[PDB]
Design a protein around this ligand. Structure first.
Ligand SMILES: *[C@@H]1O[C@H](CO)[C@@H](O[C@@H]2O[C@H](CO)[C@@H](O[C@@H]3O[C@H](CO)[C@@H](O)[C@H](O)[C@@H]3O)[C@H](O)[C@H]2NC(C)=O)[C@H](O)[C@H]1NC(C)=O
Ligand SMILES: *[C@@H]1O[C@H](CO)[C@@H](O[C@@H]2O[C@H](CO)[C@@H](O)[C@H](O)[C@H]2NC(C)=O)[C@H](O)[C@H]1NC(C)=O
Ligand SMILES: *[C@@H]1O[C@H](CO)[C@@H](O)[C@H](O)[C@H]1NC(C)=O
Ligand SMILES: *[C@@H]1O[C@H](CO)[C@@H](O)[C@H](O)[C@H]1NC(C)=O
Ligand SMILES: *[C@@H]1O[C@H](CO)[C@@H](O)[C@H](O)[C@H]1NC(C)=O
Ligand SMILES: *[C@@H]1O[C@H](CO)[C@@H](O)[C@H](O)[C@H]1NC(C)=O
Ligand SMILES: *[C@@H]1O[C@H](CO)[C@@H](O)[C@H](O)[C@H]1NC(C)=O
Ligand SMILES: *[C@@H]1O[C@H](CO)[C@@H](O)[C@H](O)[C@H]1NC(C)=O
Ligand SMILES: *[C@@H]1O[C@H](CO)[C@@H](O)[C@H](O)[C@H]1NC(C)=O
Ligand SMILES: *[C@@H]1O[C@H](CO)[C@@H](O)[C@H](O)[C@H]1NC(C)=O
Ligand SMILES: *[C@@H]1O[C@H](CO)[C@@H](O)[C@H](O)[C@H]1NC(C)=O
Lengths: 219, 106, 221
């Protein structure tokens, strides 16, 4: 009966579907029974003397996802100082206002002050040529590119475009920060330090990096 | 199909008044040494509803009879995305409604 | 906060004159970085790391220059279990960082005097576990002659007799042979995980340092 469920492991309990619904009896039959191996709960009142309690597949919730997450928060940080931290980002837009990756993998955005990390199969290279001592490199997912660039022992300049991840964002504040003319189907993400205005020119106007060939094909 | 889980309980004797102007996440050193989800007993929350001395929200945890207070909004914004990437956000279809007001307003 | 990211860098005149040559160390060993600094006026001292497996920017461990009270720790996410150290020595303070070296923890480490805005790089340590080498196809296997620190611009290992190597395919026709320190398991059993990326953040610095014995390596301009 009691056995392993991990990650998206709804297959076994899809037919071994033990159940629990209602208010009374302190969830003893399910929670206290599964205490035999694990029982972990959340509780939230709905009124004086009335409370909602959640019991979870703590071991499954304790899967690799939580392993990666562990160090990714300080859930003791405050709203106003979050807001102050937000100002570190340039936010040029609103301030102006057979497959090779089968054998290679990447881990991205580690220690990132404003975003969450993740592993992925990838291809990770540069351009045919490089005027070295100013360094760039690129990494790819199946429907969005990602790049990084700088030579200065500090936060580098990051750019990402494609069908970007729909939930990957460290803070709760406004995610939309980019081009008025944004594409009909794909999204762009660029992050840089506030001080880059003094040196980065291409952010100040329309476009960069194409021989008058910008659009992705469709017809 | 998924595993099945908990309920909402009435007629509790325990209450909130105990804090006596304890209104904030007063403990931080525990944060740099968080127990993982593996080692937690229970977790609690309030949108500072009953508090003159608190406005938006706060949360508490207990682990091996070890406890301290921490703010609620990051987990509200987070666990939704965690479920979404895990593909079980549908299980929140009901309780996401209850949890809705408790993300930060921006 | 106690400080923001270092805003303007500086380097000591002996920076490159005192930074030891990059070292190769077996995975899982509890390496510790030494550091020595004479009595100064800087309010803060700190240790600075640059990992070269999929890492960018810099992360810092900030210490009280005199008391030794930790003030900020950015290394936590990579090094959850690393332990620092401080020892006031009336002549001059000593501080160090300890950890178990592995593929995800190899990188460059530097001592940095610090105040709220300014900072001065003192010394650099480069820690490695695997090194790139290229072997022409029909030619016999190369044989480097690693040793202890000795002196100079030479790459070195504390336990050269534990060296072992393996190959990871082809590159532009060359066969890629990798060198590493073993004995983590019995005899030749242990084989390190295949590196996933090159050139890495360790590249520019490392390929500026020679390797003893006959062997070939792509080098900077
Ligand atoms: C962190 O420490 C650095 C140590 O250099 C502080 O910068 C230093 O500030 C002093 C202030 O007197 C500068 O000295 C003055 O500079 C000019 C040019 O030489 C001259 O008018 C005076 O004779 C005097 O020497 C010093 O040059 C400057 N150092 C550098 C490298 O620019 C910095 O202020 C400290 N940070 C904080 C937040 O206190
Ligand atoms: C990924 O590369 C590895 C390299 O080892 C391939 O695995 C085997 O490599 C050995 C030599 O070490 C070859 O003799 C084998 O033919 C390789 N294949 C197998 C199935 O053993 C592996 O094939 C590569 N995978 C992909 C998807 O390219
Ligand atoms: C539902 O739960 C009851 C006990 O609450 C149990 O007897 C029953 O078998 C469960 N249903 C299934 C399909 O397992
Ligand atoms: C309520 O359930 C919890 C969790 O199973 C259990 O530890 C506790 O003893 C129960 N309390 C009562 C009063 O039934
Ligand atoms: C408190 O405990 C008493 C004694 O068991 C019980 O009658 C009562 O319902 C409990 N609930 C509240 C809200 O006081
Ligand atoms: C203060 O805490 C006590 C328990 O320590 C609790 O009974 C009391 O209700 C709290 N204060 C007030 C004014 O109720
Ligand atoms: C507390 O909840 C009540 C409704 O139950 C509402 O009138 C009140 O504004 C809420 N206060 C806060 C701080 O959420
Ligand atoms: C503050 O206390 C007063 C007096 O009891 C009450 O009228 C008011 O609603 C309280 N406000 C909050 C936010 O608890
Ligand atoms: C729970 O209390 C006991 C008895 O004081 C103590 O030994 C133990 O460390 C506590 N548990 C935690 C997790 O602090
Ligand atoms: C590090 O390695 C040592 C032995 O060198 C071992 O005792 C220890 O458990 C390892 N782990 C950590 C986190 O230091
Ligand atoms: C510093 O290292 C020594 C051994 O060299 C050890 O005994 C001591 O506990 C360490 N101090 C700290 C604070 O880690």
């Amino acid at each position: 009966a009691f056995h392993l469920l991990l990650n998206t492991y709804g297959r076994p309990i899809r037919f071994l579907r033990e159940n629990t619904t209602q208010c009374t009896y302190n969830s003893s039959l399910r929670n206290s029974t599964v205490v035999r191996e694990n029982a972990i709960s959340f509780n939230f009142f709905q009124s004086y003397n009335q409370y909602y309690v959640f019991h979870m597949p703590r071991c499954l919730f304790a899967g690799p996802l939580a392993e990666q997450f562990l160090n990714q928060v300080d859930l003791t940080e405050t709203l106003e100082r979050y807001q102050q931290r937000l100002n570190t980002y340039a936010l040029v837009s609103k301030d102006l206002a057979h497959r090779p990756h089968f054998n290679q993998t990447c881990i991205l955005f580690d220690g990132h002050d404003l975003l969450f990390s993740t592993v992925t199969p990838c291809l990770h290279q540069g351009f045919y040529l490089m005027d070295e001592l100013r360094y760039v490199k690129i990494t790819l997912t199946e429907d969005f590119f990602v790049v990084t660039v700088s030579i200065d022992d500090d936060t580098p300049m990051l750019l990402i475009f494609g069908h970007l991840p729909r939930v990957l964002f460290k803070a709760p504040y406004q995610r939309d920060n980019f081009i008025l003319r944004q594409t009909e189907k794909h999204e762009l993400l660029v992050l840089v330090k506030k001080t880059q205005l003094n040196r980065h020119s291409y952010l100040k106007d329309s476009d960069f990096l194409d021989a008058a060939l910008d659009f992705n094909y469709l017809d | 199909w998924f595993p099945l889980y908990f309920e909402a309980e009435c007629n509790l004797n325990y209450t909130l008044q105990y804090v006596n102007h304890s209104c904030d996440y007063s403990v931080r050193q525990s944060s740099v040494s968080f127990p993982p989800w593996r080692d937690i007993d229970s977790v609690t929350f309030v949108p500072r509803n009953l508090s003159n001395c608190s406005a938006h929200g706060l949360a508490v945890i207990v682990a091996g009879n070890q406890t301290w207070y921490v703010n609620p909004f990051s987990l509200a914004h987070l666990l939704d995305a965690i479920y979404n990437v895990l593909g079980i956000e549908d299980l929140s279809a009901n309780f996401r409604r209850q949890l809705a007001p408790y993300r930060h307003t921006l | 906060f106690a400080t923001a990211d270092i805003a303007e860098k500086m380097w000591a005149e002996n920076y490159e004159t005192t930074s030891p040559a990059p070292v190769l160390v077996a995975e899982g060993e509890q390496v510790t970085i030494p550091c020595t600094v004479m009595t100064h006026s800087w309010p803060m001292v700190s240790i600075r790391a640059r990992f070269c497996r999929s890492h960018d920017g810099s992360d810092e461990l900030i210490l009280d220059a005199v008391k030794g009270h930790r003030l900020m720790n950015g290394l936590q996410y990579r090094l959850p279990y690393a332990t620092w150290n401080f020892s006031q020595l009336h002549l001059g303070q000593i501080f160090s960082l300890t950890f178990n070296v592995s593929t995800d923890t190899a990188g460059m480490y530097e001592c940095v005097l610090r105040n709220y805005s300014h900072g001065l790089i003192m010394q650099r340590f480069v820690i490695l576990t695997q090194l790139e080498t290229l072997s022409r196809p029909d030619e016999p296997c190369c044989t480097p002659a690693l040793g202890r620190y000795s002196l100079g611009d030479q790459i070195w290992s504390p336990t050269p007799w534990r060296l072992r190597n393996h190959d990871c395919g082809m590159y532009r026709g060359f066969q890629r042979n990798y060198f590493y320190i073993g004995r983590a398991d019995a005899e030749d059993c242990w084989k390190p995980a295949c590196p996933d990326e090159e050139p890495d953040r360790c590249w520019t610095v490392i390929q500026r340092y020679r390797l003893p014995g006959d062997c070939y390596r792509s080098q900077p301009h």
